[PDB]
Amino acid sequence: MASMERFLSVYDEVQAFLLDQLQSKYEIDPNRARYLRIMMDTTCLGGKYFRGMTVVNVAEGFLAVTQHDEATKERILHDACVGGWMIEFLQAHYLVEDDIMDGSVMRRGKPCWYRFPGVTTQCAINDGIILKSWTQIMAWHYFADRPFLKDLLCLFQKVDYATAVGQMYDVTSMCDSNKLDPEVAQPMTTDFAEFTPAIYKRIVKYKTTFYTYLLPLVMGLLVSEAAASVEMNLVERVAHLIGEYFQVQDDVMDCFTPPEQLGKVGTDIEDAKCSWLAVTFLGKANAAQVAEFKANYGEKDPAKVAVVKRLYSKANLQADFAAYEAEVVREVESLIEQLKVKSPTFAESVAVVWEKTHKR
Amino acid sequence: MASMERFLSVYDEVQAFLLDQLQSKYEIDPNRARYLRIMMDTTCLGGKYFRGMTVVNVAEGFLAVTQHDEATKERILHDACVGGWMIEFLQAHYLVEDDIMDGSVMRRGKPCWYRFPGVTTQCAINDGIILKSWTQIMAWHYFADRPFLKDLLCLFQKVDYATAVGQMYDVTSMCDSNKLDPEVAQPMTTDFAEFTPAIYKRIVKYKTTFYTYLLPLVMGLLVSEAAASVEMNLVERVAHLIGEYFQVQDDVMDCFTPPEQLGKVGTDIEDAKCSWLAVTFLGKANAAQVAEFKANYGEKDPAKVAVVKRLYSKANLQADFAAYEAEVVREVESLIEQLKVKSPTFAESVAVVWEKTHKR
Numbered sequence: 043m044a045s046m047e048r049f050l051s052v053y054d055e056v057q058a059f060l061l062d063q064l065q066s067k068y069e070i071d072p073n074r075a076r077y078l079r080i081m082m083d084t085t086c087l088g089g090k091y092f093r094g095m096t097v098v099n100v101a102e103g104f105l106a107v108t109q110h111d112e113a114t115k116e117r118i119l120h121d122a123c124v125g126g127w128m129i130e131f132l133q134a135h136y137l138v139e140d141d142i143m144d145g146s147v148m149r150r151g152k153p154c155w156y157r158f159p160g161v162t163t164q165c166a167i168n169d170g171i172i173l174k175s176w177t178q179i180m181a182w183h184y185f186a187d188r189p190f191l192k193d194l195l196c197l198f199q200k201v202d203y204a205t206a207v208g209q210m211y212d213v214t215s216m217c218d219s220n221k222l223d224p225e226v227a228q229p230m231t232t233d234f235a236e237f238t239p240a241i242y243k244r245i246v247k248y249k250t251t252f253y254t255y256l257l258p259l260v261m262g263l264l265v266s267e268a269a270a271s272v273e274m275n276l277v278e279r280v281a282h283l284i285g286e287y288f289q290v291q292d293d294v295m296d297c298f299t300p301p302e303q304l305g306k307v308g309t310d311i312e313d314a315k316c317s318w319l320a321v322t323f324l325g326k327a328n329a330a331q332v333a334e335f336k337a338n339y340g341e342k343d344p345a346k347v348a349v350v351k352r353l354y355s356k357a358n359l360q361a362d363f364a365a366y367e368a369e370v371v372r373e374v375e376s377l378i379e380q381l382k383v384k385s386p387t388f389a390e391s392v393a394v395v396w397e398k399t400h401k402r
Numbered sequence: 403m404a405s406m407e408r409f410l411s412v413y414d415e416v417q418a419f420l421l422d423q424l425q426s427k428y429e430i431d432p433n434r435a436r437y438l439r440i441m442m443d444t445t446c447l448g449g450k451y452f453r454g455m456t457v458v459n460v461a462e463g464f465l466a467v468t469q470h471d472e473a474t475k476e477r478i479l480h481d482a483c484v485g486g487w488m489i490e491f492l493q494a495h496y497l498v499e500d501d502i503m504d505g506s507v508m509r510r511g512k513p514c515w516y517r518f519p520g521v522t523t524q525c526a527i528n529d530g531i532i533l534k535s536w537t538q539i540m541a542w543h544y545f546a547d548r549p550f551l552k553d554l555l556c557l558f559q560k561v562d563y564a565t566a567v568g569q570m571y572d573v574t575s576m577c578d579s580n581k582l583d584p585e586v587a588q589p590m591t592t593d594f595a596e597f598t599p600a601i602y603k604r605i606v607k608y609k610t611t612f613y614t615y616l617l618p619l620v621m622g623l624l625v626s627e628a629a630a631s632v633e634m635n636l637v638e639r640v641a642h643l644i645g646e647y648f649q650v651q652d653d654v655m656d657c658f659t660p661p662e663q664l665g666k667v668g669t670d671i672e673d674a675k676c677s678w679l680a681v682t683f684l685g686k687a688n689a690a691q692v693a694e695f696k697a698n699y700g701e702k703d704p705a706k707v708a709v710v711k712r713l714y715s716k717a718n719l720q721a722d723f724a725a726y727e728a729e730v731v732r733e734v735e736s737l738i739e740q741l742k743v744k745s746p747t748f749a750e751s752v753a754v755v756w757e758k759t760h761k762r
């Protein structure tokens with residue numbers, strides 16, 4: 043059975059289980075069950091399932107080289123699908139809440155969930171909470187008897203926490219750290235001294251890399267009972283490298299990819315985000331260019347946004363991106379070679395993850 | 403050592419552990435650590451600690467009748483304090499998010515967290531997420547080696563999920579169920595047919611009773627390794643009775659307790675909430691009174707709110723509350739007697755919980 047069809051079939055199974063349990067144990071009525079079914083479909087479906095399918099693909103790699111009964115292969119693949127959906131539902135939680143936090147308009151070609159007429163922010167904040175709860179309901183039901191349950195839940199909660207910490211780093215990245223204060227309204231930085239590579243790398247590591255790359259790779263190892271057969275420091279290092287490249291791509295697309303293709307209007311400039319474009323521009327600009335950037339960044343005024351995008355263009359940041367990409371290729375290939383010492387099979391799964399990321 | 407001082411000392415310990423770990427493992431800087439320290443204090447402190455201290459008091463009851471080394475007594479009480487703070491932090495999560503969802507102005511005499519000038523909704527939604535994450539970070543750290551970890555985490559997540567489901571029941575309680583639809587903006591009910599005792603009881607059971615009464619009582623049993631020594635169906639039944647009374651009190655206070663004493667301005671009438679007052683009024687009103695209620699309920703117009711409060715007064719609902727209270731006393735005393743068959747010690751802890759609730 044092809045992997046994607048198995049993954050989608052398991053979605054239907056998990057949805058049916060969750061909604062039936064709401065009826066049998068939480069006294070839910072049919073109309074609220076329908077609302078939650080639509081909420082689940084709208085928030086969890088429609089992406090590429092990169093994260094969830096990485097769990098399945100890692101598990102498939104070990105199945106190809108490991109002796110198992112057929113029923114065990116089926117069990118492991120079912121577990122990989124459930125675990126993949128745990129990650130997809132975690133992402134769905136963060137996208138629902140982040141779109142509210144940021145006042146976002148569109149996602150995946152459609153209105154953000156909180157903007158649906160019958161949802162509103164009052165319901166959507168709680169819907170996001172339910173999405174996160176469902177990740178745990180899934181795990182306890184499907185993995186109740188599994189040897190990896192404790193490790194999986196502990197990993198999942200640390201990744202969730204890291205992601206929340208990363209969200210804090212992201213939403214505060216345009217303020218001066220020494221002025222953070224719940225009592226005082228926060229002004230945007232004027233000096234942009236905290237727009238550095240090291241600070242950017244911290245934002246991305248926590249806000250994206252743990253849940254997008256580390257969690258799927260390690261969950262795939264756990265459902266395969268294969269974690270002891272890799273060097274976990276290498277898994278972390280390669281996750282944090284590929285995840286950074288993934289975010290840099292997304293940063294470049296926020297500014298330069300046409301909205302029809304991105305699925306939304308990018309607003310990183312207006313939001314004064316610490317993006318790869320802004321850090322790299324500030325790393326090569328002259329004084330006059332720095333001053334013009336400062337005079338126009340972080341403003342909803344479209345003329346000011348056009349100034350910034352013009353500065354980025356004239357700064358030939360496409361050349362910095364090519365240099366950055368070539369260095370990532372060097373380092374990822376090096377880490378893949380190191381992974382081969384202990385697990386050639388896992389190294390190949392990582393190579394696939396990199397290829398998919400590099401060519402998306 | 404008095405119980406409350408132990409509980410407050412453990413708060414300081416848990417805070418220090420969480421903030422130190424953010425520094426040592428999550429690369430946090432001092433100013434963001436300070437922001438999170440202030441957020442923790444502002445959202446988690448200042449209440450009565452009823453829920454957290456119930457864990458401690460249940461554990462203390464078993465310590466008085468169970469043979470243990472002194473070091474074991476200290477361990478059990480420390481665990482009860484950590485578990486109590488898990489519940490207090492869970493409540494803090496829900497209060498932060500609910501105040502945003504509802505547009506609330508004040509809580510506990512102070513502005514709601516999202517209204518602090520240096521917070522804003524963008525940060526406060528994520529701060530609430532962090533509060534919930536911290537409940538799990540606490541558990542995994544302090545309870546790593548404990549026999550009750552699996553049961554405790556499974557109970558905690560089911561109670562969390564129930565609470566989110568209850569929030570859904572609450573925020574949708576003024577709409578007609580058959581018209582719920584993410585695609586269509588939701589009108590307030592005109593017939594109030596779903597303002598019934600059974601529907602009210604479902605809202606309260608899920609939104610309040612599981613985390614306010616069931617979770618502290620059972621967590622106290624788990625850290626005492628005493629759950630097998632009670633009839634769990636009775637624990638559930640008595641939690642759902644006392645929790646309903648607690649909410650009915652809060653509903654009456656929303657309408658009639660002066661804001662200086664309540665800590666906020668009550669808005670249940672303007673918000674068209676399915677409150678005990680509205681259900682009980684609709685259960686005894688004549689046709690003309692029903693019509694006047696319908697013409698004025700669910701409106702921010704202060705004159706319409708005064709109409710409703712006048713209808714409540716003239717309806718002598720204080721007599722319904724006295725009748726309701728007398729019936730709760732009958733049923734709680736009956737359940738306490740039944741709890742004595744297997745655990746006279748636990749029955750006494752429940753009697754204390756009831757006394758504190760009844761007299762607050």
Ligand SMILES: O=[N+]([O-])c1cccc(O)c1
Pocket residue numbers: 092093096254255258288395396398399402
């Ligand atoms: O492009 N991605 O986002 C991606 C590709 C492959 C795996 C993964 O977890 C994420």
Ligand SMILES: O=[N+]([O-])c1cccc(O)c1
Pocket residue numbers: 452453456614615618648755756758759762
């Ligand atoms: O009044 N309360 O909210 C209360 C009293 C005693 C225990 C408890 O969990 C809650």
Ligand SMILES: [Zn+2]
Pocket residue numbers: 140141143144212
């Ligand atoms: Zn965001």
Ligand SMILES: [Zn+2]
Pocket residue numbers: 292293296
């Ligand atoms: Zn972006």
Ligand SMILES: [Zn+2]
Pocket residue numbers: 500501503504572
């Ligand atoms: Zn509310």
Ligand SMILES: [Zn+2]
Pocket residue numbers: 652653656
């Ligand atoms: Zn209330």
